[PDB]
Amino acid sequence: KKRVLTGVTTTGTPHLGNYVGAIRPAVRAAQNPDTESFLFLADYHGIIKCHEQEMIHQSTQAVAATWLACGLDPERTTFYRQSDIPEVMELNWILTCITAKGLMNRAHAYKAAVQANAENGQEDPDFGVEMGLFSYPILMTADILMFNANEVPVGRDQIQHVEMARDIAGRFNHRFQELFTLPEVKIDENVELLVGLDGRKMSKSYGNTIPLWENDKKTQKSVNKIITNMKEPGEPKQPDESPLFEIYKAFSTPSETAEFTQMLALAWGEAKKLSAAKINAELAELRERYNALTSNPSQIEEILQAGAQKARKEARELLDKVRDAVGIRPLK
Template identity: 80%
Template sequence: MSKKRVLTGITTTGIPHLGNYVGAVRPAIQAARDEDTESFFFLADYHGIIKCHDPAMIHASTQAVAATWLSCGLDPERTTFYRQSDIPEIMELNWILTCITSKGLMNRAHAYKAAVQDQNAEGGGDHDQAIEMGLYSYPILMSADILMFNANEVPVGRDQIQHLEMARDIATRFNSRFKPLFTLPEAKVDENVELLVGLDGRKMSKSYGNTIPLWENDKKTQKAVNKIITNLKEPGEPKYPGESPLFEIYKAFTTPAENAEFTRLLADGLAWGEAKKLLAARINAELAEPRERYAALTARPAQIEDILQAGAQKARQKARGFLDQVREAVGIRPLK
């Protein structure tokens, strides 16, 4: 029985924070340990330059994201871990798929429609003028990422389901027009994956400025945790879930029994300040060893590069032969 292929892409546009760790990194690495799964993880740096036009950030993020996944337990021997830009076969497949994708399909993409709506709100002339082709064609490149390795499942948030549906549409059109080569991927939306709330109770996001850093030291983690919003209840007054994001963040780092005890302590009057110390201690305890590994890796970026190049070699071995089949199917073949 062949293994199920699961593919995960991580865009290189920022430095990972605690919400990324809880919502994406930790569950994906746990899932990759399944003996019946063949996992592909890639740094989506070509996707990154669609919205991020700061070369220094793309470069720094590539290192930080790679070091994050490796430090948190991603095993490059058991998985295929690579940088998107190191696999030229993906970009060639991207062009082949572009040639068979209808403009109408791309016109329906949520990101494109939202960008047009923003332009309409600003007024002026041609509302497509400020929309670049990277944004417009993003779903095709994502399709190439997925279809190149015939992934069976792609873990995504609900905002990405449409892109998986587009990948299936594109694959179906190719399979019908030329040859049935592509597996139709399934979107995997795990309702049990935690979306960590931020300091202000909204989703933890760098755009909101409400994140807790992942790779800072214990003291800076405590300083960030201290900024979690609470009410004005004094020590001794009962405090309940819903009154502060503190409860939800603590839950992400404990067992159900431990979380119940924390909730009881606050209901019995534990001070907010003491509760924040307990939370920071939990976070720092879980991340102590990963932080050591992260510091060691980022101090030796050449080691990260070696791992990525080994992963690229593994990925290209799979991609090259399959792309040859795709080229043959569309008529790009040697003259004999």
């Protein structure tokens, strides 16, 4: 049985792009009965940059309620906070000891920070760089290896995370004993990165998001914020003129998408009404479950605690083998 392990960030509230791009297909994929599904909230990766203490907490609750509301089943998926698995932190140090510094030197996030200092005219390549940025790839590797995942769903952007995990696993196996499975990349072949309000990728960094969990009316006003042009009612408009089209398609079947493209060839304001209606219709049931979870967050706490208890039973078994293999053993 193939063990599949997904880490999800906790540094902001999910928006429409997260739902279309990651959450909706991840919940379907997790239903595969041939797979053992693990999914964790990466709340200790969260504090690499996000030192607003209120943020990681609010985001953890928002992200956890979001996945539950969209159908993640904690009876099928082992579902836990990274901060509830102390075994991962011990493994993190063990792996650090067998990881070449060269491997962290070459990691993309660090290199982009170094380049940004060069472009900004900084004489120090490590200006403003903290060790969480330099060393999180070892922590992410521990996240994966602690559960001997066979597959790790990642963005094509993040393939290097799994390669570093495979490299570190192999160095441990060669230095001590072969305890670790080399994890493998899983790419979503049909992933659609959703466009935001201003035509760039929808991103918290850009302030161009459409929120996931606001009511019908507040969603309408957010869809109204999408850029269009000065084409009036009756002027024919092609799908490439406004991010409004790609947004409608992400919440519609190919049939409705084609009837929508023919209506355009129609007023922007009315196209924005049709787009918001389609979004609100799909999210209506998910929003009631989201609002029930967030209105009683101790339901979420209980779920995370039950998922942590499951995860730690697996992590303890392996950690005991790792400790023995690195020579940490009782005096007898």
